[PDB]
RNA sequence: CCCGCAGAAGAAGCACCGGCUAACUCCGUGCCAGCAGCCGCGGUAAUACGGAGGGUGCAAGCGUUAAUCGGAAUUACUGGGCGUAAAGCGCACGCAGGCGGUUUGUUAAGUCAGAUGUGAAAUCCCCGGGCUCAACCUGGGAACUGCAUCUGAUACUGGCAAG
C-alpha cells in the first residue's frame, strides 16, 4: 500500500523530470503544499496549484533549462521506517549549500538556511541538488 | 573629497607592526570623514631589482578617499618614517570597491 | 599550454591462427590546468604508436570543468562500469590526495587541493571515465543562479 | 579528616606539587576533593611558581579542615609578602 | 646518528648538487655529476611513482641531515601546527641550530657548522646550546663563543658566505661574529625546486 | 632600424578595457621585451588610446618595482 | 538489509582464525623433536625438504620446517619454533628457530645472518 | 651545572637489491642444494638459491615472529548485495511484530529550542610556561560528544476524541 506520500511526490518530480512531462497531478494535502510552497522561492518548479474540495488535487508545473531537468537529484531522508532527526547545530549541508534540505521545524517546514539563520532543528524530509 | 590609492612599501624587518601602522594611518584619515572603502594587501614580496639593498620588501595597498589636506599629511609622515622606504600616493578618479589581481591569484 | 601525463600501459592480445599476436595499449589524460581536461585511450602494437594514437583521442573529445581558484566547487560521485569515485573540495595546502589513476587526471585538470577515494573497481581506464563524468556534472553558481532563475547573492546567502 | 596538603606530581629530581583538598585517609596521589592549587619549588626565582585560591581555601578552613605543616607555611609566605 | 660515508656519492646521484662540499673547488672536477654511483650507475633508470616520492625526501633530508625517525616526528609537527604543513615542515627544517649558523657562515659546510655546535662553541642568549636540534625562535641572537672565534677555521667560512646571497631573515655581523634571527622563513626564500607538497602526501600514506 | 607592422588586434580594445592597471603584472608581462623596454604599437598591434596608458603604466610598475628597469642590475 | 531486520539480529563481528593455532597467540614455543625425516614439496617443485615433528610443551604435535644448511637435529632434540608457513609443504606452519637452544647456527653464512644465528664472522 | 687537562684519539652495524618495492652485475650451483609475505625461482649464460663486488633503506639499532586496527565499502548505520557470479523460503493464510491514505480539535510522548545541575583528576586537543633542545613536566582554556530536571515551541510522528 501507499505509506509515503512525501516519497510519492519525489518519484512523480524525478519520473517526470526524467519524461519530461511539463506537468504531474497527484493527490494534495498540506504537506506536499507546504513541500511545493518551499520549492517555490527557490526556483526549483514552476507553478504549483491545488484543485477540488472533497478530493484536493496537487499540481505541479515542471521546468526545464535546456531541455534538461531542473530537479537533478531529489531522496528521501526521513523514512517511515527510519527516521532522521538533526540537531541545529549539526544541521547537513545538501549540495555545498547549492541546493537546499526540506526541514520540519517547530515553527513549520522551511529551509536549511531559514532554520539555520533562525537557530532551529527539525526533521530533514528531503535532499534537493 | 578626492580617492587617492597610497601603495607604501615597509622595511622587510619590521612587518611585525604594519598591522598596527593600518590602525595608525586609518584612524586620522576617518577623522575627516576618510572612507577608506578598501584596504587590500600583498604581504612580502620578492623586490624586482634591489632597492636600498633590501632584495625584498613588504607591499600594502589602500585605495582610500579622504579631503586633500589630510592626506597631504601622510605623505609628510611616509617622507619622515624610515619604516616606510618608499610610497606613491596615486590619485583615481572614482573609487575601487573590489579585488586586484594580486589577491585573484590565490 | 598541454601537458601530458602515462596513467597505464598494457599488453592486451588476440590469438591467431598461427600463435598469440601481442598488442601495447596507452591511457593518457591531457589538460591546460584552467578548468579543461580530456583522456585519452590508444592500441597499438608498438608502445610509441600507442602514445601517439592517445594523444591524439585525448586531443580530441575534450571538455571545460567550472574550477574554482584550483579548487573543487563541492563533493562530487562519479560511477562509469563499477568503478564509483568520491571526490570532496580541500583547503588550500592539502595537495592531491587520490589513487595513482585519479592522481594523474587533476594535474592537468588544474586542481590542486582535493580529497578523493576511489570505490568498488579500481580499474584504471574505468576509474579515469568515472571522475571525468563527475566532474562534467559539477556546475558552479554563475550557472546555478542562471538555471534556477535566481541571482548569487540571494541563494548564497553571503 | 578532610585536609589539605600537596601532592607530589612531575618528574624524577623535578617534583612539581599539586595543592588538592583531600581526606587524609586518601593516597597521597589518590581520590581528592577539590583543587586549591600548585606549587613549584623549582621555580625560576623570576615568574610566578605558586599561586591559591585564598577564598576556597578560607571556607574549606570554615568548613573544618585541618591545614598541613608545609601548606601553612605557604599560605604564609603569601599573605605576608602581599 | 650521524652519516659517515663518502659525501659526492650522495650528491651526484638524484642528480642535481645541493649544498654539500666546502664550496669553493668546483663540484663538478671533484667527481663526475650527471651520473648515480655504482658500476651500473651509466645508464637511464626509467624512475617509477614511488620512486620519485622517494627520492624528494632522501634529497631533503640530507641537506639538512636530519635521520628519518627525527625527520618523521617534524612531519607530525607541521601537520599539528596551523597552517600549510609543507612550508611549516621547511621552516622547522631551516630553524635547526646546525642548519642557521651555517647560513650565519661561521661554517664552511653544514656538517662542519653542526660540529661547531656540537663542541660547544656557540652561544644562545647567553647560554651555551650543543644540541644541533635545537629551535631558533624569532628576534633570537646567537653568537660565536669568546674561545670560538680564535679559530681560523670559522673566519675563513665567513669570507666564503658572500658568496650565498644572505638569507633574508638573517642578520649576519661579520667582525662582530654574531646574528639575529630576525623571523621563520617563507616558502618563496627556500629553493624553488623543492616541492613541499609531495613531501606531505608521501607520509600521508 | 626602422620595420613598422601589426599583429591585427588590439588586445585591450577587445577585452574592453577601460582603464589599464599598474597592478595587472600578468597583463604587464606580455608586452614587455626581455631587456625590459616597451614594445612599440608598431609590433603587437595595440591601439594608439590605450597604449599611452600602458605605457604610464609601465613606468610606474617599475618606480613601484613591479617591473625592472633594462636587465643588468649589476 | 533492513533496519528492522538489522535490529532483530545484529552484525555478528566475525572471530579471524589464526594460521598458527599450536602458538595459542604466542611469538614462540620451545618443544622437543619427535621425529627427524624428509619429505617432498608440493607440485611446481621438486626437492628433498627437511622437516621434523616436533612436541611442543603444551602438548600440540606439529611439524616444523628446517631453514638452514645442514642441521645437527635427531630424536629427543630441544628447539625453539616460530610462526611462517612454508608456501610449498601442506601442513607445515612454523620454522625451526637457527642457533637457538640445541639447534646450531648455519655454517658459512655471511648474509641475512641474523635469521639463522650464526655470530659474524672475525675480520 | 661549571671550569681546566690531553689527544681523532675510546664509540656502526642490520636488512634488502625478480615484480609488488627503493636499489645489479660477476662467480659458483644445475628442479640439486636451496629461497619464499604474495606472485613464484632453480632442469648448465640464475638481476630470485650460494659467494664476491657494487648499490638501497634504517640506524645504536636493524631484522624475524606473535598480536590489534587500518587498507577491507570484506557484516556496508554512515557504507553492500540476492535474473545468470554467494545469496527469493515450493506456495498461501495468519498472530505477535514492523509499517500505515485523506480531516479538525486535543495533549506533549517522541521530537525541537531554552536554562540549570551533573560529565573526578589525569589522558586527548588548543594557547602558554619549565627543564640547554627533545621526549618530559606543568598553567589556562577547550573538550567530556552524556544524562537528569525544569520552562517553552508544537510543524511532524505517536496519543485519544470525533471526520
Ligand atoms: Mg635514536
Ligand atoms: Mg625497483
Ligand atoms: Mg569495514
Ligand atoms: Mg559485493
Ligand atoms: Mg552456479
Ligand atoms: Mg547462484
Ligand atoms: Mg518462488
Ligand atoms: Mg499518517
Ligand atoms: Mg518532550
Ligand atoms: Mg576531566
Ligand atoms: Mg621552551
Ligand atoms: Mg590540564
Ligand atoms: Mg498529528
Not at chain 5, 641531515?65 to 604543513?85: C, D, I
Request: aromatic residues 6%; contains cysteine.
Amino acid at each position: 500500500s501507499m505509506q509515503d506520500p512525501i516519497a510519492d511526490m519525489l518519484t512523480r518530480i524525478r519520473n517526470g523530470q526524467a519524461a519530461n512531462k511539463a506537468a504531474v497531478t497527484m493527490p494534495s494535502s498540506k504537506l506536499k503544499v507546504a513541500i511545493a510552497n518551499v520549492l517555490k522561492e527557490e526556483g526549483f518548479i514552476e507553478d504549483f496549484k491545488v484543485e477540488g474540495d472533497t478530493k484536493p488535487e496537487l499540481e505541479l508545473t515542471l521546468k526545464y533549462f535546456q531541455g534538461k531537468a531542473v530537479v537533478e537529484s531529489i531522496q528521501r531522508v526521513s523514512r517511515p521506517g527510519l527516521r532522521i532527526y538533526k540537531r541545529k547545530d549539526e544541521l547537513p549541508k545538501v549540495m555545498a549549500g547549492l541546493g537546499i534540505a526540506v526541514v520540519s521545524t517547530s515553527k513549520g517546514v522551511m529551509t536549511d538556511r531559514a532554520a539555520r539563520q533562525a537557530g532551529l532543528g527539525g526533521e530533514i524530509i528531503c535532499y534537493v541538488a | 573629497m578626492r580617492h587617492y590609492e597610497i601603495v607604501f612599501m615597509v622595511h622587510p624587518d619590521q612587518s611585525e607592526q604594519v598591522p598596527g601602522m593600518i590602525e595608525r594611518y586609518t584612524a586620522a584619515i576617518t577623522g575627516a570623514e576618510g572612507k577608506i572603502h578598501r584596504l587590500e594587501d600583498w604581504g612580502r614580496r620578492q623586490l624586482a631589482y634591489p632597492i636600498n639593498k633590501l632584495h625584498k620588501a613588504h607591499y600594502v595597498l589602500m585605495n582610500v578617499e579622504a579631503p586633500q589636506e589630510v592626506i597631504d599629511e601622510l605623505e609628510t609622515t611616509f617622507r619622515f618614517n624610515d619604516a616606510v622606504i618608499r610610497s606613491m600616493v596615486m590619485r583615481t578618479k572614482h573609487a575601487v570597491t573590489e579585488a586586484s589581481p594580486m589577491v585573484k591569484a590565490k | 599550454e598541454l601537458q601530458e601525463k602515462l596513467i597505464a600501459v598494457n599488453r592486451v592480445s588476440k590469438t591467431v591462427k598461427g600463435g598469440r599476436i601481442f598488442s601495447f595499449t596507452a591511457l593518457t589524460v591531457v589538460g591546460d590546468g584552467n578548468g579543461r581536461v580530456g583522456f585519452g585511450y590508444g592500441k597499438a602494437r608498438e608502445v610509441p604508436a600507442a602514445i601517439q594514437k592517445a594523444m591524439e583521442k585525448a586531443r580530441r573529445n575534450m571538455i571545460n570543468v567550472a574550477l574554482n581558484n584550483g579548487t573543487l566547487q563541492h563533493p562530487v560521485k562519479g560511477v562509469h562500469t563499477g568503478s564509483r569515485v568520491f571526490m570532496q573540495p580541500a583547503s588550500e595546502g592539502t595537495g592531491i590526495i587520490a589513487g595513482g589513476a585519479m592522481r594523474a587526471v587533476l594535474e592537468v585538470a588544474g586542481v590542486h587541493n582535493v580529497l578523493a577515494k576511489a570505490y568498488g573497481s579500481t580499474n584504471p581506464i574505468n576509474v579515469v571515465r568515472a571522475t571525468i563524468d563527475g566532474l562534467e556534472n559539477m556546475n558552479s553558481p554563475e550557472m546555478v543562479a542562471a538555471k534556477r532563475g535566481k541571482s548569487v547573492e540571494e541563494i548564497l546567502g553571503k | 579528616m578532610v585536609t589539605i596538603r600537596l601532592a607530589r606530581h612531575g618528574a624524577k629530581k623535578r617534583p612539581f606539587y599539586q595543592v588538592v583538598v583531600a581526606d587524609s585517609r586518601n593516597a597521597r596521589n589518590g581520590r581528592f576533593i577539590e583543587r586549591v592549587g600548585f606549587f613549584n619549588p623549582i621555580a625560576s626565582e623570576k615568574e610566578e611558581g605558586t599561586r591559591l585560591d585564598l577564598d576556597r581555601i578560607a571556607h574549606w578552613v570554615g568548613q573544618g579542615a585541618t591545614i598541613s605543616d608545609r601548606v601553612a607555611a605557604l599560605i604564609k609566605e603569601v599573605n605576608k609578602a602581599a | 646518528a650521524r652519516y659517515l660515508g663518502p659525501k659526492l656519492k650522495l650528491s651526484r646521484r638524484e642528480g642535481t648538487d645541493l649544498f654539500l662540499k666546502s664550496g669553493v673547488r668546483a663540484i663538478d672536477t671533484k667527481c663526475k655529476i650527471e651520473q648515480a654511483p655504482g658500476q651500473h650507475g651509466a645508464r637511464k633508470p626509467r624512475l617509477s611513482d614511488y620512486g620519485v616520492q622517494l627520492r624528494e625526501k632522501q634529497k631533503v633530508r640530507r641537506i639538512y641531515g636530519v635521520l628519518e625517525r627525527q625527520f618523521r616526528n617534524y612531519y607530525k609537527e607541521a601537520a599539528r601546527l596551523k597552517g600549510n604543513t609543507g612550508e611549516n615542515l621547511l621552516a622547522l627544517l631551516e630553524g635547526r641550530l646546525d642548519n642557521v649558523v651555517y647560513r650565519m657562515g661561521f661554517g664552511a659546510t653544514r656538517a662542519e657548522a653542526r660540529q661547531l655546535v656540537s663542541h660547544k662553541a656557540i652561544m644562545v642568549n647567553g647560554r651555551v646550546v650543543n644540541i644541533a636540534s635545537y629551535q631558533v625562535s624569532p628576534n633570537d641572537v646567537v653568537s660565536i663563543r669568546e674561545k670560538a672565534k680564535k679559530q681560523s677555521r670559522v673566519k675563513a667560512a665567513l669570507e666564503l658566505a658572500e658568496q650565498r646571497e644572505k638569507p633574508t631573515w638573517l642578520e649576519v655581523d661579520a667582525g662582530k661574529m654574531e646574528g639575529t634571527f630576525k623571523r621563520k622563513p617563507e616558502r618563496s626564500d627556500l629553493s624553488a625546486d623543492i616541492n613541499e607538497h609531495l613531501i606531505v602526501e608521501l607520509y600521508s600514506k | 632600424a626602422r620595420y613598422f607592422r601589426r599583429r591585427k588586434f588590439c588586445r585591450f580594445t577587445a577585452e574592453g578595457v577601460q582603464e589599464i592597471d599598474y597592478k595587472d603584472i600578468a597583463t604587464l608581462k606580455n608586452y614587455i621585451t626581455e631587456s625590459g623596454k616597451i614594445v612599440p604599437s608598431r609590433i603587437t598591434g595595440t591601439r594608439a588610446k590605450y597604449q599611452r596608458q600602458l605605457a604610464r603604466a609601465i613606468k610606474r610598475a617599475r618606480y613601484l618595482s613591479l617591473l625592472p628597469y633594462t636587465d643588468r642590475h649589476q | 538489509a533492513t533496519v528492522n531486520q538489522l535490529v532483530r539480529k545484529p552484525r555478528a563481528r566475525k572471530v579471524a582464525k589464526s594460521n598458527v593455532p599450536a602458538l595459542e597467540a604466542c611469538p614462540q614455543k620451545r618443544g622437543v623433536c619427535t621425529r627427524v625425516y624428509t619429505t617432498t614439496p608440493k607440485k611446481p617443485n621438486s626437492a628433498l625438504r627437511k622437516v621434523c615433528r616436533v612436541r611442543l610443551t603444551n602438548g600440540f604435535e606439529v611439524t616444523s620446517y628446517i631453514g638452514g644448511e645442514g642441521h645437527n637435529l635427531q630424536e629427543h632434540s630441544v628447539i625453539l619454533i616460530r610462526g611462517g608457513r612454508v608456501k610449498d609443504l601442506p601442513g607445515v606452519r612454523y620454522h625451526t628457530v637457527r642457533g637457538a637452544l640445541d639447534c646450531s647456527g648455519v655454517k658459512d653464512r655471511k648474509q641475512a645472518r641474523s635469521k639463522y644465528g650464526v655470530k659474524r664472522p672475525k675480520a
